[PDB]
Design a protein around this motif. Structure first.
Motif, PDB file in Angstrom:
ATOM      1  N   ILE D   1      -4.347  -7.597   1.911  1.00  0.00           N
ATOM      2  CA  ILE D   1      -4.239  -6.862   0.652  1.00  0.00           C
ATOM      3  C   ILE D   1      -2.894  -6.148   0.733  1.00  0.00           C
ATOM      4  N   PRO D   2      -2.034  -6.311  -0.288  1.00  0.00           N
ATOM      5  CA  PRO D   2      -0.706  -5.683  -0.320  1.00  0.00           C
ATOM      6  C   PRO D   2      -0.791  -4.180  -0.476  1.00  0.00           C
ATOM      7  N   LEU D   3       0.351  -3.519  -0.334  1.00  0.00           N
ATOM      8  CA  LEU D   3       0.427  -2.075  -0.527  1.00  0.00           C
ATOM      9  C   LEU D   3       1.190  -1.862  -1.823  1.00  0.00           C
ATOM     10  N   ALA D   4       0.769  -0.857  -2.584  1.00  0.00           N
ATOM     11  CA  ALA D   4       1.411  -0.561  -3.853  1.00  0.00           C
ATOM     12  C   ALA D   4       1.123   0.860  -4.257  1.00  0.00           C
ATOM     13  N   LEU D   5       1.874   1.341  -5.236  1.00  0.00           N
ATOM     14  CA  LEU D   5       1.671   2.682  -5.748  1.00  0.00           C
ATOM     15  C   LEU D   5       1.512   2.570  -7.257  1.00  0.00           C
ATOM     16  N   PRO D   6       0.549   3.304  -7.825  1.00  0.00           N
ATOM     17  CA  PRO D   6       0.332   3.251  -9.273  1.00  0.00           C
ATOM     18  C   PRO D   6       1.295   4.140 -10.072  1.00  0.00           C
ATOM     19  N   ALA D   7       1.576   3.714 -11.299  1.00  0.00           N
ATOM     20  CA  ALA D   7       2.460   4.462 -12.177  1.00  0.00           C
ATOM     21  C   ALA D   7       1.789   4.668 -13.531  1.00  0.00           C
ATOM     22  N   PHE D   8       1.659   5.914 -13.968  1.00  0.00           N
ATOM     23  CA  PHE D   8       1.048   6.161 -15.272  1.00  0.00           C
ATOM     24  C   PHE D   8       1.158   7.591 -15.737  1.00  0.00           C
ATOM     25  N   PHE D   9       1.117   7.754 -17.053  1.00  0.00           N
ATOM     26  CA  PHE D   9       1.173   9.074 -17.667  1.00  0.00           C
ATOM     27  C   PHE D   9      -0.288   9.483 -17.664  1.00  0.00           C
ATOM     28  N   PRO D  10      -0.609  10.626 -17.052  1.00  0.00           N
ATOM     29  CA  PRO D  10      -1.978  11.141 -16.961  1.00  0.00           C
ATOM     30  C   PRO D  10      -2.507  11.541 -18.318  1.00  0.00           C
ATOM     31  N   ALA D  11      -3.798  11.316 -18.551  1.00  0.00           N
ATOM     32  CA  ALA D  11      -4.392  11.686 -19.827  1.00  0.00           C
ATOM     33  C   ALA D  11      -4.153  13.188 -19.994  1.00  0.00           C
TER      34      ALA D  11
END
Ligand code: PUY
Ligand code: PHE
Ligand code: PHE
Lengths: 266, 785, 233, 157
Positions: D1-11
């Motif tokens: 399973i790869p490594l990654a970081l999530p990106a998003f504007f929080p509600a």
């Protein structure tokens, strides 16, 4: 002669408890990653501590937590929206119930980390306590994958032990996650694999419990098209390895000769 | 620059309104600092024709006989008043923006002045009030309300950044709006030229200064007032009309960011020579100022035989002599491109800032001269009845701009947008770029007027601004930071916590200027500041502070004068300069002290401040102590250096009484350290459970001896089991060996595992009692019941 | 994700101007009224501790730190550099010769302007609430292209506040960085990356946020003034 | 399973939700610096102490305590502090001590409490005699704490 090397007025010098220090560093690390810290109540209802987290009663899985049950009327436990709630009271056996409280009171996407004192009926020795601390992690939102959980822990390790640090994930069981997993970190100095905590992708039933409680409360569903990961790690175990403390009982011991030793680390 | 709406509207006819224009320009990268409505002209002001001007004997006034529908008379003292011009007549009853008191019939020096003829200032169109407005005699039917041919106008104060020199011309602005989709109307310089030789030559003796220089030739000139429309246009842009020829050169300059100057041939001679000025050469500029030229000043000169003379300061301002006037019949039109740096230096050197220098300093279209000549000459032909030679005198040949590689795919990637290729390419064309190739990487060569377009990036900004910055999506980046970026915030965090601990401990933070008065090096007795300001704000702030405490003492003073703080515990962290820039922490103590306000006892002075510092370090977990040492700015009696973790890092003590005197201040205590403070690792010391040994004993020592030696001596000798060690009492007196003192010492011993037997202590304590004498001290504290 | 690092107040013309595409006798260099310095004995160190040369000055902005950092580290990263800056100006009610700025620099593959807008958007939300909004307009800076000024909507005041400028790191900045790198033995590290930078004034913001009328107080020293912020810690 | 970081504007409603937690943390740090030493004591209490320390009986009890001494949920914070002061005076002999503890107390409703403890000779010159101690010393510190927090303070009878 005006001896300048003479002791001055004995003004008191304070300090912070080692767990406060460890918790702070842990919170700083996750804040930098977008996580916000919120706390929950120590006295919880069976519903939030167990049922909402897919841990039913008379469940062989409910034995993974040695619970302290409580008694007494007059006590008013409030829910996520201040509403009074019912159910057999207890001392939370982990911080996980806060995952549920938060989700019913807010909307995705978000990143939280919830520190807090937890309780379990156990014999207190050198590396065991009935009263310790945990730090939960919860990230929910569209397209949130396990690749992100692994990414989170990876950053945790790097921040905690340096670039020669590494993490390992192995399958393990938790009623509130699936896939489930335990993760360990490589501590270069000690040259050992430290087991830090467990984690996984929020279990489908958790989201359902959340939205069910929501409708039962008038709010609209907010978790049908999202996924997420959660993790929980023990604070003492980490504080010990990091401040070179031999006995976990000291934390609650109260020895100034002990606490005073962390005035340096603030 | 001022942007007159209706003038701009002549190139961009579809403009919605001044307001929509301000929005459009804002998105194009031009902010307007103000929108102003400008020419309110009352019904009372009509156009009049001056039939005759009669001087009133014995005065310096004239009786003007005006045709304003009916004939009327007016008295005027304006030197430009004369027969044959049109004027702005304010009829009796008119309320003018200025005077506030209506205009009326009035008797002046024997004649009934039926109203009055106006100056630009009186009509409210310009600041000039030295003469009357001068119009064409037939501009309008006599008596026609002037407003009918001079409507109010709206003018925007536009900010034009250095990268858009092309925007220093209204037509430049129009091009940008055209790129947005507005139709563009470019003036057609219609010429009816004549093939004949120019009666003069051109000699560019300095090609670096004038990389491109052209001369136009117009003759048969009929110098007169500019049409009302041009005067309104010029006035709105902040310029005063002079006459048709001069006005045309100013109008075109404002239209296309191209300064130009008509030189009266009468003064040119055999030719014009663009050359450096010979030191000592004089030149009276058209502003009336008599100047003397520097050899670095580019000059526009003429020559007659063996004579060479300055006609104008190139690209900055023309001379007073050759300047065009009513008897001028022919001229040499100067349209050029000068060296920015050159004009830059000259302009500064002579304290001149003109519409011309401004534009040449910012840059001019390297190939816009010829088209500019056409425009000006065309206008001269229409407004001054000019005859124009088809040939121009030209020197210099600028090479067109090169092609820039452009990839629509990169534009969208850099912006994070997804504009279809076709829209990108069309935008670039609207702005006048040539676009070649099939893709993915095109060849785009910009118009010579766009000096700011050289890189592919510049081109992506063209697409972005025209599509609109608001059409760029919002997003957040995700990535694992490169390894060496790890913990780089440690230093900054470290200092911040120090401030917070201090802030809570009790110290109040202060911020003082990094500047210092060179004089204070003397006052506060410090080594002179190493860095100085070759351009200080004032002699008081001519050097860079060398210490932090001086600034603190100063604020304590001025604080005692505005308010009367009965005390104060301050601190400041700042950059100090000396051999190397370093971070310092300084604190200040002063006042009665601490204790019960209603009571009397107090904890104050040196030891109070030393207490706090001891706390600070106990809190920071670092070894602290202050040994004796004198400092010019301290008190030889209350002075010592600071040791953090057994390392000198600053000082501590009472300000020098003398110093306090010149500044008229009570006793002030303070310290100053160098950051960052040392770092001590945690070697967690597990505390033993077994009880500890309790023992006391005083020490006899000479009045001099520092508490330091004793403590260290006693400690080092105490053995590897000495836990505590504190001072609880000092006596020095009867019945002690006169000139000596006693130090009350509480001691404690403990052992990791096993407990300690009275033998190990009574024996180890001896190892200290005799080493206490080997040094020359005894143990007054003996046998305590 | 931003980490805070500081730079020196006394800089060389190279870092303050030349490395940031602001050449001398440049009409663009006039956007900063510089305080020039004099005096020998002073040893200014570069990004790697190495002593550097050039006409000394007081930084007219924090931007030179963008360059110092990039030569000393490798992408991708996120930094924010606060710091005291100086400009030769007349100190009045809303103007100072000595104030503070906060730089922002994010570099790495695929970094776009959409990210700069995203950054400022989060800044506004955090600063003024959900009813807050930001607006971007083109503007000029020699060290960025596209260039831009951004303003935020302050609900309470119902006004558009102009906070600072920003843009995509200029191609010449990366070149200056890698050129200084090779000249120093390090390998190039910025040829295949892009980035955005921003800079905002601290006082202007502090004033609007703590309701302070006169910017001169900050350096004034009045305890009656400073003491008023013991509450906000 | 790869490594990654999530990106998003929080509600939107996730905005500033960390305020409460931050607020208390600063309080601990100000206290820590001001001079108070932080202590961590068990949430359990001896039902007996309700009598000893003279307090209303604990409302919540443990249907399965670790021992009768820890059979109830602490109702106050100070009792635990006095206890640690004692056991501290028996293992080591602190001549004084300025402690503080922040913790969850239980009674009708779970609430967060801040408690402090003062004891000993006091503050002043060790080799000297005068001292700043007792009530007013502690009241002084508290006055400081609040001056630092920017809040009105006062103690009535
Ligand atoms: C030397 O090279 C130049 C000089 C000026 C220009 C700018 C402009 N085209 C233009 O109108 N050129 C010149 C001049 O034509 C005009 N002007 C303005 N006022 C006067 C005047 N009096 C007030 C007595 N006498 C003679 N000329 C006058 O002002 C402008 C400023 O110099 C371009 C090149
Ligand atoms: N609550 C779990 C830890 C955990 C949290 C979240 C997800 C998975 C595991 C425990 O007590 O071990
Ligand atoms: N340094 C610029 C601000 C800025 C920083 C970074 C990018 C763009 C603008 C100034 O002084 O205005």
């Amino acid at each position: 002669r005006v001896d300048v090397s003479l002791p001055g007025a004995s003004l008191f010098s304070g300090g912070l408890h080692p767990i406060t220090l460890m918790e702070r560093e842990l919170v700083e690390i996750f804040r930098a990653l977008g996580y916000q810290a919120v706390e929950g109540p120590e006295v919880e209802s069976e519903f939030f501590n167990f049922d909402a987290l897919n841990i039913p009663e008379h469940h062989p899985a409910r034995d993974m937590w040695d619970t302290f049950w409580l008694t007494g009327e007059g006590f008013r436990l409030e829910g996520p929206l201040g509403e009074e709630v019912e159910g057999r009271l207890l001392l939370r056996t982990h911080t996980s119930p806060m995952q549920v409280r938060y989700m019913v009171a807010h909307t995705p996407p978000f990143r939280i980390v919830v520190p807090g004192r937890v309780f379990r009926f156990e014999q207190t020795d050198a590396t065991h306590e009935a009263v310790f601390h945990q730090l939960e992690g919860l990230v929910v939102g569209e397209g949130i994958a396990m690749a992100h959980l692994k990414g989170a822990i990876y950053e945790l390790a790097q921040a905690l032990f340096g670039p020669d640090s590494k993490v390992r994930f192995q399958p393990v069981y938790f009623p509130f996650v699936e896939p489930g997993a335990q993760f360990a970190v490589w501590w270069p100095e000690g040259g050992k694999w430290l087991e830090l905590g467990g984690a996984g992708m929020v279990h489908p039933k958790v989201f359902q419990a959340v939205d069910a409680y929501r409708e039962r409360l008038g709010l609209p569903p907010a978790y049908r098209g999202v996924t997420g990961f959660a993790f929980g790690l023990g604070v003492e175990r980490l504080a010990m390895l990091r401040y070179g403390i031999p006995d976990i009982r000291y934390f609650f011991g109260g020895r100034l000769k002990f606490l005073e030793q962390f005035k340096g680390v603030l | 620059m001022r942007v007159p709406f209706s003038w701009l509207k002549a190139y961009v006819p579809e403009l919605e309104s001044p307001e929509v224009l301000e929005e459009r320009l804002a998105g194009l990268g031009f902010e307007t600092d103000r929108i102003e409505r400008v020419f309110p002209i009352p019904r009372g002001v009509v156009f009049a024709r001056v039939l005759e001007a009669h001087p009133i004997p014995g005065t310096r006034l004239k009786r003007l006989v005006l045709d304003a529908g009916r004939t009327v008379e007016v008295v005027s003292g304006a030197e430009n008043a004369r027969k044959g011009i049109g004027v702005a007549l304010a009829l009796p009853g008119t309320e003018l923006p200025g005077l506030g008191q209506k205009v009326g019939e009035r008797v002046i020096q024997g004649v009934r002045s039926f109203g009055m003829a106006l100056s630009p200032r009186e009509l409210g169109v310009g600041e000039y009030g030295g003469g009357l407005l001068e119009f064409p005699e037939d501009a309008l039917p006599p008596g026609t309300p002037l407003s009918e041919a001079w409507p109010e106008e709206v003018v925007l104060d536009l900010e034009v950044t250095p990268n858009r020199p092309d925007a220093l011309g209204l037509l430049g602005l129009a091009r940008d709006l055209h790129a947005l989709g507005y139709a563009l109307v470019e003036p057609e310089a219609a010429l009816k030229a004549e093939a004949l030789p120019l009666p003069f030559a051109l000699k560019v003796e300095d090609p670096e200064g004038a990389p491109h220089f052209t001369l136009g030739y117009a003759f048969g000139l009929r110098v007169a007032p500019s049409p009302l429309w041009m005067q309104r246009a010029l006035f709105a842009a902040g310029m005063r009309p002079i006459n048709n020829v001069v006005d045309v050169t100013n109008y075109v300059m404002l239209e296309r960011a191209q300064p130009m100057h008509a030189f009266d041939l009468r003064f040119v001679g055999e030719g014009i020579a663009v050359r450096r000025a010979r030191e000592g050469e004089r030149l009276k500029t058209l502003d009336g100022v008599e100047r003397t030229l520097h050899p670095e000043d580019l000059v526009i000169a003429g020559w007659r035989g063996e004579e060479s003379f300055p006609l104008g300061l190139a690209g900055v301002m023309g001379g007073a002599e050759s300047e065009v006037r009513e008897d001028t019949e022919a001229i040499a039109l100067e349209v050029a491109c000068f060296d920015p740096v050159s004009i830059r230096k000259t302009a500064r050197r002579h304290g001149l800032r003109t519409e011309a220098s401004h534009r040449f300093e910012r840059g001019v279209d390297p190939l816009g001269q010829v088209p500019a000549q056409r425009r000006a000459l065309s206008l001269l032909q229409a407004l001054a009845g000019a005859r124009v030679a088809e040939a121009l005198l030209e020197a210099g040949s600028p090479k067109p701009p090169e092609a820039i590689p452009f990839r629509p795919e990169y534009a969208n990637r850099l912006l994070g947008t997804s504009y279809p290729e076709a829209e990108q390419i069309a935008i670039l064309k609207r702005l006048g770029c040539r676009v070649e190739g099939e893709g993915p990487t095109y060849r785009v060569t910009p118009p010579s007027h766009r000096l700011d377009l050289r890189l592919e990036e510049d081109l992506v900004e063209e697409v972005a601004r025209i599509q609109g910055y608001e059409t760029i999506p919002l997003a957040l980046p995700a990535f694992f930071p490169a390894p060496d970026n790890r913990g780089v915030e440690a230093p900054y965090r470290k200092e911040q916590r120090l401030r917070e601990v201090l802030s809570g401990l009790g110290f109040q933070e202060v911020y003082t200027y990094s500047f210092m008065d060179p004089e204070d090096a003397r006052r506060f007795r410090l080594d002179p500041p190493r860095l100085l300001l070759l351009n200080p704000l004032a002699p008081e702030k001519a050097a860079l502070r060398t210490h932090l405490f001086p600034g603190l003492v100063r604020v304590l003073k001025e604080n005692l004068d505005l308010d009367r703080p009965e005390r104060a515990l301050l601190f400041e962290v700042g950059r100090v300069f000396r051999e190397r820039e370093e971070t310092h922490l300084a604190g200040l103590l002063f006042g009665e002290g601490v204790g019960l306000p209603w009571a009397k006892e107090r904890l104050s002075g040196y030891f109070l401040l030393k207490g706090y510092l001891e706390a600070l370090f106990a809190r920071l977990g670092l070894a602290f102590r202050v040994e004796a040492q004198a400092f010019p700015f301290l008190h030889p009696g209350v002075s010592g250096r600071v040791l953090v973790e057994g390392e000198e890092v600053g000082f501590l003590g009472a300000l020098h009484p003398e110093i306090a005197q010149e500044l008229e201040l009570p006793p002030v205590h303070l310290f100053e350290l160098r950051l960052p403070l040392p770092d001590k690792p945690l070697a967690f010391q597990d505390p033993s459970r077994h009880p500890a040994a309790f023992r006391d004993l005083a020490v006899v020592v000479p009045a001099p001896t520092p508490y330091g030696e004793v403590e260290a001596l006693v400690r080092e000798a105490a053995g590897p089991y000495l836990e505590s060690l504190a001072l609880f009492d000092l006596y020095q007196g009867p019945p002690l060996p006169e000139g000596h003192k006693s130090l009350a010492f509480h001691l404690r011993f403990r052992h990791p595992k096993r407990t300690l037997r009275d033998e190990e202590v009574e024996e180890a304590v001896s190892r200290v009692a005799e080493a206490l004498r080997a040094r020359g001290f005894g143990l007054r504290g003996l046998d305590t019941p």
